[PDB]
Amino acid sequence: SAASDLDELLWVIAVTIFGLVLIASILKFYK
């Protein structure tokens, strides 16, 4: 459904951002 397609989009984006923030965080710990 349009709703379920939207939920999927938002979860995929949210998790993608989290993973990228994690990588940014590990790099920040060594700066």
Domain ranges of the chain: 1-31
Return the CA Rg of the chain. 14
Tell whether the torsion through CA atoms of 18, 19, 20 and 26 is positive or negative: positive
Q: What CA–CA distance (Å, rounded) separates 9 from 4? A: 9
Q: What CA–CA distance (Å, rounded) separates 5 from 15? A: 16
Report residue 15 as tokens.
């998790």
Enter the DSSP assignment of 30. T
Q: CB-hemisphere CA count at 13 Å for 29? A: 6
Q: 25 vs 4, 9, 11, 16, CA distance in Å?
A: 31, 24, 21, 14
- Reported resolution, Å: 2.0
Q: What CA–CA distance (Å, rounded) separates 31 from 28? A: 5
State which approach was used to obtain the coordinates: X-ray
Q: What CA–CA distance (Å, rounded) separates 22 from 8? A: 21
